[PDB]
Design a protein around this ligand. Sequence first.
Ligand SMILES: CC(C)(C)N1C(=O)c2ccc(C(=O)O)cc2C1=O
Length: 336
Amino acid sequence: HMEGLAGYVYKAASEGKVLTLAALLLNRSESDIRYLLGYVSQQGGQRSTPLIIAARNGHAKVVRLLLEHYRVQTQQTGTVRFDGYVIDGATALWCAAGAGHFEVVKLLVSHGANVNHTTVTNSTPLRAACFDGRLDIVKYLVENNANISIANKYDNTCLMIAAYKGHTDVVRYLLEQRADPNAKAHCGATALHFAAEAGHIDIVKELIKWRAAIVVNGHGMTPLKVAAESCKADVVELLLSHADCDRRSRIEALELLGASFANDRENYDIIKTYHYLYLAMLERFQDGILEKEVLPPIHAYGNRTECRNPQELESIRQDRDALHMEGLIVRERILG
Ligand SMILES: CC(C)(C)N1C(=O)c2ccc(C(=O)O)cc2C1=O
């Protein structure tokens, strides 16, 4: 019964106990040793191999011994648990990149591991490191020909996932490494959209610095409207100090931004509501004008109607409750 004996090998590899592992695979023939080291074991909800689990747990010593003396392939595929989620198609490399085991990653590429291996979802180990934000790994993977153009199943680039996760220092690195800033996911989204909605004011600036294009995401919105809808005012001012539409895109962002100050405790502030929405109306009433196409009074948000004139809006810096309903009403004109 060699079944459970390969488990003791799996435990010792995961446990990092190199001597316990070293001693298990000694007076064993090559028939045996190849089986025990390539055995796929189920740890509750995790199927891996002694190499994979040891690299997944940052056990450098154990990862060294398997590659040098015992010459175990790095092609080996497994399914590991991370973040609570389950990933399939992971090499010992990929687990080590996502976990941020710097020395272990170097160990595997040093001993010939595919740096552009694709998980089932087509996530390069480089993508993993760009989620975790280990610049050391990212600089190292790129320096070993890991291709930054490889994207996940949904055309989500390492640049995007980084601009999402706030990893400013790596977004600068990928851009310096000539990562295409105008990538588009199936969502029709760009690294800008991800950063705009997320409020990563620094990353937005870098994308700006790298002549990133203003795309309207595949489902209706520019990164200006996305940041306004996500109520990230910092990003909206920075983005508005560049181009847009004449007054359409610009008054939309302001109206929308003030309107998002009516929804959820993201900064649920009506003082910043009146501020941005009154600004927006001013930019409409200069000469003559930018007409307001106001939706009909409906049973839901009270039978109110959007303010058309600045005079109608000037009458509500007081009366808090009416301002709240205005946010809902306008958010319905610009979105629906
Ligand atoms: C969704 C994508 C594909 C970007 N993806 C990983 O491949 C991945 C690997 C490791 C972690 C972690 O946080 O440890 C998170 C992710 C993660 O979001």
